[PDB]
DNA sequence: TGCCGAGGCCGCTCAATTGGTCGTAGACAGCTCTAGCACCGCTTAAACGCACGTACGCGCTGTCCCCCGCGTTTTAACCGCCAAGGGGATTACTCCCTAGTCTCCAGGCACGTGTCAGATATATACATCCTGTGCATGTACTCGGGATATTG
């Protein structure tokens, strides 16, 4: 809905692989426009 | 009474192990070496093991004779405990430096041969050093009496 509504925006998942989640934290160590998340996380 | 508050059972979601499947890369098993030099077989003249009273050395033996063992219990603090406090050992993160890879590149030297010598072995003659024996004292010991040190 983002990527379609607003190509304007940068969008990054947040969810799976602890391997990936750490990885993602460096890239937000603001261009990351919009993070999306889950309650359990 | 009341209310409710506190109370006790059951599907998501994530996070290690566990076991499974993919594909690919040297390293293992095996072949033929081949090649050669050790194992063998065959003699020989050779050393050294070995089955075997007797002199006799000492391993084992029958006695008595005593401390250190054997037994008791008081106590004495040794040793254990628990609980609290402080920090320092620990954890999790970010930056950082080099460990490690490969690659090129040389010559140092460990490798190898090529000759043949000063070395040490072996014999005979032998003298000498060294062992086994026999043989005095000199001390290091065991005891008794008193002085100094140290525990309670």
Redesign the pocket.
Known sequence: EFTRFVPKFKVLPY????HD??VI??FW?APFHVVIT?Y??
Do not use: D, F, H, Y
């Not at 969810?15 to 602890?18: K, V």
């Open positions: 969810w799976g692989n602890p989640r750490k934290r460096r160590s889950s359990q996380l």
